[PDB]
C-alpha cells in the first residue's frame, strides 16, 4: 500500500504485493524493472491467461492485462497461432 512508514521502509513484494492489492511501484520497486513488473502487474488483478496453454503450434505465451500475446513461428498466423 501507499503509507508513510510502509514505503518509508524498503518495499518488499512479499510485504506489499500479496496481502495488499499490489497496485504499483510497490509492484515495481522490489522488482526494479519494467521487464518484470509489467509481467507481474497482469498476474495479480486479472490472472495469468497463459495457465491454459492457449498458444498452439509450440508458440510462446506472454501475459498481459485483459489478454495474452502469442508468438507463432514461420508459416503460423492468427489470433492464437491456430
Amino acid at each position: 500500500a501507499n503509507s508513510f512508514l510502509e514505503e518509508m521502509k524498503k518495499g518488499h513484494l512479499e510485504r506489499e504485493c500479496m496481502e495488499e492489492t499490489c497496485s504499483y511501484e510497490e509492484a515495481r520497486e522490489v522488482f526494479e524493472d519494467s521487464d518484470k513488473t509489467n509481467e507481474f502487474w497482469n498476474k495479480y488483478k486479472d490472472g495469468d491467461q497463459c495457465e491454459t496453454s492457449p498458444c498452439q503450434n509450440q508458440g510462446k505465451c506472454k501475459d498481459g492485462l485483459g489478454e495474452y500475446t502469442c508468438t507463432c513461428l514461420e508459416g503460423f498466423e492468427g489470433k492464437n497461432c491456430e
Binding site: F4, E7, M8, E25
Partner: protein
C-alpha cells in the same frame, strides 16, 4: 512554586536527511504545435529523479 511551563511553540524534530519520503519522476518538455504536446526528453536529464 508551580508556575507551569512556557510551551506556546511546538518543538519538532526532522529526518537526518531533510526528507525521506521522496518519489521518482521523469522530465517532460513542451511539444511544438499541439497546444499541450507534452513529450518526454532525456537527452540531458536522467530519466529518474527524486
Amino acid at each position: 512554586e508551580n508556575h507551569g511551563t512556557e510551551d506556546e511553540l511546538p518543538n519538532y524534530c526532522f529526518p537526518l536527511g531533510g526528507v525521506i519520503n521522496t518519489e521518482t519522476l521523469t522530465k517532460v518538455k513542451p511539444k511544438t504545435g499541439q497546444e499541450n504536446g507534452w513529450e518526454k526528453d532525456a537527452t540531458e536529464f536522467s530519466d529518474k529523479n527524486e
